[PDB]
Design a protein around this ligand. Structure first.
Ligand code: TYD
Ligand code: TYD
Lengths: 224, 224
């Protein structure tokens, strides 16, 4: 994030990785580039499907030109398969296939460590019920488009996180990024993680896993 | 809770008090009796206002006859003033007056320590959106009736917890108890706790505080 004018800014993807409220850190040469390219591909797929996103263009390498937005202080999580923190909320095992998608709202607040909230907390934070409902509707639509597109490539979309903001017309626009950092991707054949869980739980090689996704999505080996 | 037949059971209120997931325990001679009497008064007030509750009758002392129900595995929390765990979810101080009531759903599960959930988790637990909406509507109605009744007696209803079950007609019925154990009651004049927070945070004498509520509500000193 680095400003350009009133209408747009630069989003730069870095090689840095963090986990567990920032207590785990490492750097992976090439991750910024992979995450940038993959966000681009995802943003363009969603745009074709009529999802408003902040993507404007590529600013070479690890940099995207994105629309400026009044950002909602939310992380919006959609879950298809039980994994991560959902295991501490429902007595269901890792890999449990949900009967329908779960949407969870988290309040972006470092002091409180991003606690889960509901519609009522959101309202006190200044987000109307109508806004929340539009946000969840978009998230669920994004889920269908991504889940289908990836299943046709042997990838299970386990869960993912989105962020949103409001544009000058008061429309709700998909923001941040969509990448193996912010999604769980499982190989359909083997159930193995091809995402940030590789780094989180030391499941092998992060760069190999992200390359895997990139190759399996684009049909080409990453040039860098 | 001790069975009678298919239609009804006994709910006995004991002198035992627990806090902090059961790590804090103590006994207060007379608390069972106070909590029983106060639940009776609250249940009867709500019934007059058209709230369906499980209250059937008094079985002498600390015992109520209550209707048997298919219990939802929920604790339903309504909040008017910021206190307790809400302070860890919203960066708002103790005593902050909410612009409108907050309803929170907790999944009753000791293994998971009663985590907060939303409508989607509820659905996976087998509770339909329609049920959840009816449950919250009742809770918000209970809030208005109790808040008004108590304000007319110099008591601020800060927050409280309800439980619910389904009767043989599939109607949603208010269950468990309503007492200084399951509500925050503040003196309007002084802001002091007249509830289980006295025991939770060692704010003085629990029995005196509960007697206070009882005297201030009934207009009479507790006979036991
Ligand atoms: C809460 C949160 C989730 N996510 C993504 C990662 C996962 O794909 C999905 C669900 O995460 P979750 O299981 O809730 O948390 P954790 O990553 O700590 O196990 O949402 C983020 O990228 N950032 C966040 O701050
Ligand atoms: C979660 C929970 C709340 N409550 C009641 C007590 C309070 O009046 C209100 C809000 O409680 P809360 O502040 O969420 O938890 P704590 O009591 O740990 O501070 O709901 C219960 O009686 N039992 C429960 O298990």
């Amino acid at each position: 994030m680095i400003p350009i004018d009133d209408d747009k800014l630069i989003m730069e993807f870095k090689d840095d990785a963090t986990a567990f409220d920032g207590t785990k850190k490492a750097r992976f040469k090439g991750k910024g580039w992979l995450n940038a390219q993959l966000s681009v591909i995802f943003f363009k797929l969603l745009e074709e499907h009529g999802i408003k996103t902040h993507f404007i263009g590529v600013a070479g390498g690890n940099r995207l030109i994105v629309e400026k937005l009044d950002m909602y202080p939310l992380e919006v999580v959609v879950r298809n398969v039980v994994a991560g923190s959902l295991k501490k909320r429902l007595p269901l095992p890792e890999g449990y296939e949900l009967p329908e998608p779960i949407v969870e709202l988290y309040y972006k607040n470092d002091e409180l460590h991003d606690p889960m909230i509901n519609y009522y907390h959101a309202k006190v934070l200044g987000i109307s019920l109508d806004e929340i409902k539009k946000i969840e509707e978009i998230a669920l639509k994004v889920n269908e488009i991504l889940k289908d597109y990836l299943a046709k490539k042997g990838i299970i979309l386990v869960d993912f996180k989105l962020e949103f903001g409001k544009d000058k017309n008061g429309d709700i626009v998909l923001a941040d990024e969509i990448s193996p950092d912010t999604c769980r991707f499982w190989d359909a054949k083997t159930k193995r993680s091809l995402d940030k869980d590789v780094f989180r739980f030391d499941k092998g090689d992060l760069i190999e896993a992200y390359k895997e996704i990139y190759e399996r999505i684009t049909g080409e080996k990453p040039e860098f």
